[PDB]
Structure 1
Amino acid sequence: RPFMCTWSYCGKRFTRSDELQRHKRTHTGEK
């Protein structure tokens, strides 16, 4: 699965691109 978050500290792979969008959406700060 070519879906991995860029957050190194995160250390978690994904199966859907949408996940990273929303998950990363709150990886830091708040936005």
Structure 2
Amino acid sequence: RPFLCTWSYCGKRFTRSDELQRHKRTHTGEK
């Protein structure tokens, strides 16, 4: 696990930072 969002009830792992960054945008982006 190079990258991982580590968010509760998600914990999605990634091998590229831009993908994690993009993904994190779903956890810090309600509206």
5+ residue gaps, structure 2, are: none
- Which structure 1 residue ranges, 5 or more long, are not aligned? none
Shift of 1:6: 2.3
Identity percentage of aligned residues: 97
Number of matched residues? 31
In 2: Cα distance, 1:6 partner to 1:12 partner: 7
Q: TM-score, normalised by structure 1?
A: 0.52
Tell me how large the CA RMSD over aligned residues is: 2.1
- TM-score by length of structure 2 reads 0.52
